[PDB]
Amino acid sequence: SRPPVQIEELIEKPGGIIVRWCKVDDDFTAQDYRLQFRKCTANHFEDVYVGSETEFIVLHIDPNVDYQFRVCARGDGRQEWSPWSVPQTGHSTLVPHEWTTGFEGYSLSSRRNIALRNDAESSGVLYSSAPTYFCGQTLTFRVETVGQPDRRDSIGVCAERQNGYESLQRDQAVCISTNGAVFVNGKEMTNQLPAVTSGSTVTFDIEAVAKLRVTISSNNREVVFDWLLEQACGPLYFGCSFFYPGWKVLVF
């Protein structure tokens, strides 16, 4: 036969790709759709979605790597999958994660992705240079060097770049401290992760279900919890704070 569905839209975004398809033959009666992808460098397609929706959000894909997508459909009362759409190639976009420049208390590396708490006074949180955390991304930090821990230490993500506070342990923010404590809108939760040392990584994965599901992983343990935001979620900031010198954090 001939293909009853084609890919209509590909939305390339920093944290993934949205694929949308449309029926190009009104006379076909669709029950289910089947979406596959592969890296353009790879031989083999894999199913990512089988269901009756006409769009699917593809997450957790290597950024600025080309992927190829194809879709087909089942229906008309039969069980054979239709022929495939023409394939379409897409990639996630590139929005680099970088620290703010010129914030007193922190010195950055050349590519502005490594931040060191120096010997100067600091007024609070070192934020990302802009809100470049997009839900769907895995945001990874690595501790390069350590200093003395302090309860105001934090690494996290938040809705706004707010001045004044000493840490991200505050409303409309999620973060971990250097003792492994996890804070949601400024309230610590019971489950802890292992305290960070040099070489430790911390990852944040955030998915929407105003209410987000957050996974934080560090030192091969993870916590998963709900994060309630008081307004609609857009791109987020990330940030860190360290009271004492010597803490050095790389963001990927």
UniProtKB/Swiss-Prot annotation:
UniProt superkingdom: Eukaryota
Keywords attached to this entry: Coiled coil, Cytoplasm
Domain named Fibronectin type-III: residues: 3-96
GO biological process terms, semicolon-separated: negative regulation of cell growth; negative regulation of G1/S transition of mitotic cell cycle; positive regulation of DNA-templated transcription; positive regulation of receptor signaling pathway via JAK-STAT; positive regulation of transcription by RNA polymerase II
Job of this protein: May play a role in the negative regulation of cell cycle progression.
Annotated family: Belongs to the cytokine receptor-like factor 3 family.
Name of the protein: Cytokine receptor-like factor 3
Organism of derivation: Mus musculus (Mouse)
Encoding gene, per UniProt annotation: Crlf3
Full-protein positions shown: 179 to 442 of 442
